[PDB]
Ligand SMILES: Cc1cccc(C(=O)O)c1N
């Protein structure tokens with residue numbers, strides 16, 4: 001990949017792998033989310049944040065700070081097929097003075113048509129205590145120059161789906177997958193559960209009959225609390241409707257909420 | 269990637285991704301096994317295959333992994349370019365072997381090697397069978413004529429009868445279940461998932477202080493989408509060796525057996 005001419009965004013092409021596709025011989029949404037992470041991490045390396053940290057800035061490393069996702073919203077129009085080339089463009093923007101947004105646009109490498117778009121919100125956490133830490137300036141200065149000055153949104157529309165508030169799923173859930181546990185392949189380089197794993201866990205409670213006859217169009221996922229290496233998760237889903245579902249991930253023990261989300265599915 | 273000049277092997281470069289590395293910021297052995305599968309699949313596409321030949325598809329025959337042996341000297345770091353070369357070799361009526369060599373794309377040094385055994389099986393009855401002359405003739409042209417081994421030992425450590433782990437196991441990870449990300453395009457559990465499951469029963473203290481050097485894994489039966497697996501490990505031994513067994517949580521049916529060798533970091 002490479003930075004664009006103005007140095008305010010990063011672009012990269014990926015060839016969809018054999019093990020990256022599902023039943024339809026097209027990329028899974030988890031493969032997509034992994035590619036968004038990879039282009040985001042290559043964008044960080046191209047602006048001088050080395051591979052000694054997981055896309056953390058130089059001042060973040062001095063403060064023992066890491067990045068944590070607060071929200072993820074992905075919309076796919078066409079999933080790339082096995083062997084197809086997909087080009088992803090990514091950029092960052094501070095959101096006033098609370099968090100940081102990372103957006104992506106996915107395109108067909110040949111025709112240039114937009115096949116997908118994503119947006120995410122990020123906050124910082126102390127890697128040792130695992131407490132969310134407030135940005136008291138200085139950190140913003142270290143990366144402001146790397147953001148577009150004028151607002152640039154992947155979802156520029158008024159009242160788009162990425163801005164919607166998510167309610168908490170009421171018991172009893174219509175569908176469930178219980179006793180989900182992460183394995184070592186689910187962890188990132190900081191030994192935290194990869195943000196993509198929670199997408200896989202939310203989708204575990206969707207009935208196979210929906211998965212086989214419909215395609216995932218939109219997923220919005222809020223991250224409230226991290227799942228630890230020794231935690232057990234329960235995935236709950238209820239139909240709210242195109243098929244729409246409300247999702248909740250909670251710890252098997254005490255029932256503490258870790259994620260809430262919604263998904264929209266289109267018939268094939 | 270591309271076939272080599274003689275068309276008897278296939279080569280491909282890969283850039284190690286952020287999500288493909290572990291705590292050491294180097295590729296996990298599961299990432300390596302996924303890349304071996306990918307270059308093996310691309311080799312098959314380059315020679316006109318599906319995996320299956322014309323006569324295999326008429327006889328309802330498929331290829332299935334019987335054994336996998338991987339040895340890693342240096343795991344590539346996040347961002348490093350790794351070049352993998354792969355080829356197949358006939359084993360007569362027994363089946364076929366697929367070998368791989370991993371190299372540092374910059375220096376050319378061999379950083380790893382792998383070998384696998386494949387047997388034919390009727391897709392309906394699940395019965396393993398000998399390779400017929402008609403089937404063999406359909407793929408011998410794509411194999412090197414002179415034998416070419418990734419492990420050119422006469423009495424190699426890759427090939428040896430793995431014993432069955434005796435109960436009680438020293439270590440265990442129980443109730444492992446595959447999720448949709450663990451399935452391949454045919455909705456079968458990906459062969460690499462079994463490596464991840466075997467490694468789940470290794471104590472974290474060994475993982476943090478040691479690097480995996482050798483893994484040998486036998487495949488006896490496939491885990492279904494609705495199955496639950498138990499991973500069992502016992503130390504057999506600066507080097508630590510373990511004996512492994514994967515079995516179904518219910519009836520205790522064996523699905524895999526293996527061994528791993530680890531070296532202090
Ligand atoms: C550390 C980091 C940087 C940029 C993107 C991601 C992501 O997972 O999408 C990520 N985890």
Ligand SMILES: Cc1cccc(C(=O)O)c1N
Pocket residue numbers: 043044047049055056057092093143144146147
């Ligand atoms: C503005 C900006 C661009 C590329 C990467 C980062 C980062 O935090 O890794 C970042 N903050």
Ligand SMILES: Cc1cccc(C(=O)O)c1N
Pocket residue numbers: 311312315317319320321331355356357364407410411
């Ligand atoms: C030599 C060779 C290359 C690629 C695939 C096959 C196969 O039969 O699946 C094979 N036998």
